[PDB]
Amino acid sequence: DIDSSRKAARFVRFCDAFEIPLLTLIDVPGFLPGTSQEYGGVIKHGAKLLYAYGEATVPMVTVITRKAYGGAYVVMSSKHLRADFNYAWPTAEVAVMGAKGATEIIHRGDLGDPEKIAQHTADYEERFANPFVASERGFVDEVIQPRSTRKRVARAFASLRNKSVQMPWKKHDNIPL
Amino acid sequence: LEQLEDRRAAARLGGGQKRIDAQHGRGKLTARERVDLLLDEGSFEEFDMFVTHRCTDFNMQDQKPAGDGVVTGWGTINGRVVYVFSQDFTVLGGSVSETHSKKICKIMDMAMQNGAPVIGINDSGGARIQEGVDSLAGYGEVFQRNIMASGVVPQISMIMGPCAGGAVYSPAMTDFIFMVKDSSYMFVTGPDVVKTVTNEQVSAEELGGATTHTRKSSVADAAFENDVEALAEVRRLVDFLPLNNREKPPVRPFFDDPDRIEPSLDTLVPDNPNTPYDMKELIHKLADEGDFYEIQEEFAKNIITGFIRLEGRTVGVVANQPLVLAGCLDIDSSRKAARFVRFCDAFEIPLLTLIDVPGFLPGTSQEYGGVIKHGAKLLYAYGEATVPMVTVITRKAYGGAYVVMSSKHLRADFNYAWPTAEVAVMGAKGATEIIHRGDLGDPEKIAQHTADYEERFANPFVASERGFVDEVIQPRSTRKRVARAFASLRNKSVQMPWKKHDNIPL
Amino acid sequence: LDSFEVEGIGHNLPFLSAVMDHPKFISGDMTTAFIAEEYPEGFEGVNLPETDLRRVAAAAAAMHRVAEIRRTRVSGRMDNHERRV
Ligand SMILES: *C(=O)CCCC[C@@H]1SC[C@@H]2NC(=O)N[C@@H]21
Ligand SMILES: *C(=O)CCCC[C@@H]1SC[C@@H]2NC(=O)N[C@@H]21
């Protein structure tokens, strides 16, 4: 939400400005709905955290514990923001949106049949709410056993101690305010 | 979920237990087994294990294996991070697809962002035809990466199966190419097309086998006996290399003394000038624990290129071999050393050049073959190089060759000479016939004119009066002279003029 | 003999070692045809007995580790993730 975003956004930038690596633990559903949010400017504040990870060049390791849906999924140090390690728990679910809403969009002429959509959802759920479609794509470097996280992450950072990445030259950024 | 463990173990099976046997049948280890022996025991972290291709043509989508033909990830070699990919021949022939390359690029891109070598284990049937241009593009992104990393992070290629077509061009651009004696091969065009177009009938092994390449084409750096030693020798190699172009050669303990004397050396150069000796004897005695990892041993044998350490640090070495072609420099010896020098320089590895060359190898074959260009490559290499350069002339240093062999005019640091050294424009004989024309009809004049040129110029002292040889030393002390010479150059820093890149002859 | 080191030429050091270990030499029961009787096919090489292979195995194994540990002390290794012999 606006606030959670402004809160993490700055944290990230400070850690990056100062070579401190980032560990991002994910389980986000999406953004918080509301007239309050939109009129409040989430379009801009929401972006801040996104901007932060996009800009960050310290070593970035990620572990999605459960939910990773849509835009928020991308914002949480996704692999598209160039994070280094994108780990996932088996209980992870990365997808465009929830099976339900997904279904209503993909299968319009099928709502008047509460069993079609009840089944259409039961399939999206079974086929997409997990970490494996993202695995086939490479967006999750690996799916790991929860107990080993400490071990996985620790060495992941270890191997990144030498990381060195270059952002294009510029006086400074123009991040939304 | 133990479901995870299942998926995992399912993937690990590759093209299945039946194919795994087939593979083992050819004396070839599996993709994963090769990775297993390459990286520090339990230090491998795999990436993209469940990657599946995105092909839809030719019912390709009914066969979507996990991993899609290549095993990628990272690990360590003696504790140092290394990035790797091993092609899994049992899976769709380890055929290159859009996604198979992507996997390789991921770790190439990671190797570069973190400054760590990339070991490529090629064992592929070639491109995945059904993918069409996507297979081509797949190669493209690897090539590009291969190119950008050239001289930025060491790229060791290991061929352990087939390698055909565009594919060859990748290992082509890496810093080293090792092949496994009988189970491997590589060529741009297949034996069957060589027939239908040349009417020539040749077998894959003949066309591009480990031997053909380690001694005829100039493409491989060594042919290992089998998959196991292949892997073992590669780590050995890695233990010498720096992790990237920023840091300098790695250091480690060394149970040898920088002041060791080899008196045996004092008699290595035979009295008779027509009798060879093995330049390699010297190399071993100078080398630290006598260890000398040779590169392209079986090729251009008239010259030796390899790695050794001194005081536990890596030193590259280029030296002339009297035993072959009388230590002549020739197109191939030139190409062979030239690149070695360039790789060592691009990576801050010092050079020790041991000299005893008579000149270049005469011949229509050489001239029509372009020695003018190839010959220059080595010259170009030493001219460009800025790492520390120590030289020891053991005997012959005549003319052009003399200059090319890390001469002082190429701004080498130490130009040492054994008393048996002879640096001069050309041999006493030829020299005389040019200097004294009107005297040939008097076979005693020229017999005497030569005897004087010989007595006055065939040695290292005229060059010493000039400063070209910083000093003439007692052979036994070479190890001592050279060791501290390098020690004192550890801080060397020299600047070449700014430029996007060089234009060395091709 | 075991410590006599020779390199560069072919020599009989191993052969000598062989006869020194030859029982008949040990028992002294030797004739002037000994050489001809015992080595009719030239020097067929020598091969160690279990308790010998055993001792050697252990030594090589012991030395190998020593050397292997040294490969481990390379500079530039991951701080808390070195190779463990
Ligand atoms: C039950 O599923 C009612 C719909 C709630 C949708 C949830 S609320 C926050 C999440 N982000 C979003 O935009 N919608 C998701
Ligand atoms: C003696 O037999 C005649 C001299 C032969 C010349 C030799 S052959 C290779 C050396 N390089 C060169 O150009 N001349 C030397």
3-state secondary structure chain A: CHHHHHHHHHHHHHHHHCCCCEEEEEEECCCCCCHHHHHHCHHHHHHHHHHHHHHCCCCEEEEEEEEEEHHHHHHCCCHHHCCCEEEECCCCEEECCCHHHHHHHHCCCCCCCCCHHHHHHHHHHHHHCCCHHHHHHCCCCEECCHHHHHHHHHHHHHCCCCCCCCCCCCCCCCCCC
**Parallel, antiparallel, or unpaired for β B414-417 and B389-398?**
parallel
C77:B41 CB<8 A: no
Taking the C-alpha atoms of C60, C66, C71 and C74 in order, what is their torsion angle to the nearest 10 degrees? Answer: -170
Q: Answer for the pair B331, B375: CB distance below 8 angstroms, yes or no.
A: yes
Ligand with minimal distance to B330 CA: 2
Handedness of CA B470, B474, B475, B478 (dihedral sign): negative
Please give the distance of CA C19 from its chain centroid, rounded to a whole number. Answer: 16
Cβ-count burial of B478 within 10 angstroms (0-12 exposed, 13-18 middle, 19+ buried)? buried
Residues 6+ apart with CB under 8 A from B5: none
Handedness of CA A129, A130, A136, A141 (dihedral sign): positive
Please give the distance of CA A137 from its chain centroid, rounded to a whole number. Answer: 15
Token pair of B221 as six digits: 């750096």
Picking from A53, A50, A51, the residue whose alpha carbon sits closest to that of residue A16 is: A53
Q: Answer for the pair A89, A144: CB distance below 8 angstroms, yes or no.
A: yes
Cβ-count burial of B281 within 10 angstroms (0-12 exposed, 13-18 middle, 19+ buried)? middle
Token pair of A58 as six digits: 């310290």
Report in angstroms the alpha-carbon separations of B194 from A54, A80, B123, B202, B299: 51, 45, 22, 8, 25
Q: How was this structure determined?
A: X-ray
> What does the alpha-carbon distance between residue B59 and residue B137 come to, in Å, rounded to a whole number?
21
Picking from A166, A138, A73, the residue whose alpha carbon sits closest to that of residue B107 is: A138
In degrees rounded to 5, what are phi and psi of residue B438? -70, 70
C74:B81 CB<8 A: no
Provide the CATH number for the domain formed by A1-177 in this structure. 3.90.226.10
DSSP B248: -
Q: Answer for the pair B145, B180: CB distance below 8 angstroms, yes or no.
A: no
**Parallel, antiparallel, or unpaired for β A85-88 and A22-28?**
unpaired
Picking from C20, C24, C23, C18, the residue whose alpha carbon sits closest to that of residue C48 is: C18
Count the neighbouring beta carbons within 10 Å of the beta carbon of residue A106.
Answer: 11
Q: Least CA distance to C71: which residue of chain B?
A: B78
DSSP B251: B
**Catalytic residue at B165?**
yes
Count the neighbouring beta carbons within 10 Å of the beta carbon of residue B289.
Answer: 13
Mutation pick for ligand 1 pocket among A4, A31, A67 (CB with most ligand atoms within 8 Å): A31
Residue with tokens 């950024």: A173
User: Is any atom of ligand 1 closer than 6 Å to the C-beta of A69?
Assistant: no
Which of the residues B8, B48, B84 would you substitute to probe the A interface, choosing the one with the greatest number of A C-beta atoms within 10 Å? B48
Q: Answer for the pair A6, A42: CB distance below 8 angstroms, yes or no.
A: no
Token pair of C39 as six digits: 């080595």
Q: Answer for the pair B165, B204: CB distance below 8 angstroms, yes or no.
A: no
Domain range list for chain B: 1-252, 253-506
How is domain B1-252 classified at the CATH fold level?
2-enoyl-CoA Hydratase; Chain A, domain 1 (3.90.226)
Three-class SS of residue B400?
helix
**Catalytic residue at B166?**
yes
> What does the alpha-carbon distance between residue B378 and residue B383 come to, in Å, rounded to a whole number?
8
Question: In chain C, which residues have their Cβ closer than 8 Å to the Cβ of A161?
Answer: 78-79
> What does the alpha-carbon distance between residue A37 and residue A44 come to, in Å, rounded to a whole number?
11
Which candidate in B166, B312, B369, B430 is catalytic? B166
> What does the alpha-carbon distance between residue B350 and residue B267 come to, in Å, rounded to a whole number?
27
Architecture of the domain delimited by B253-506: Alpha-Beta Complex (3.90)
Picking from B181, B46, B34, the residue whose alpha carbon sits closest to that of residue B103 is: B46
B4:A145 CB<8 A: yes
DSSP H helix total and E strand total for chain B:
19, 15
In degrees rounded to 5, what are phi and psi of residue B417? -150, 140
> What does the alpha-carbon distance between residue B185 and residue B174 come to, in Å, rounded to a whole number?
17
Ligand 2 atom closest to Cα of residue B361: 9
> What does the alpha-carbon distance between residue B49 and residue B6 come to, in Å, rounded to a whole number?
13
Token pair of B304 as six digits: 């030796």
In degrees rounded to 5, what are phi and psi of residue B350? -65, 170
Classify A101 in phi/psi space as left (phi over 0), alpha (psi -120 to 50) or beta.
alpha
Q: Answer for the pair B243, B153: CB distance below 8 angstroms, yes or no.
A: yes
Cβ-count burial of C7 within 10 angstroms (0-12 exposed, 13-18 middle, 19+ buried)? exposed
> What does the alpha-carbon distance between residue B438 and residue B449 come to, in Å, rounded to a whole number?
12
DSSP C71: H
Count the neighbouring beta carbons within 10 Å of the beta carbon of residue A87.
Answer: 24
Specify the resolution in Å.
Answer: 3.2
Q: Answer for the pair B392, B417: CB distance below 8 angstroms, yes or no.
A: yes
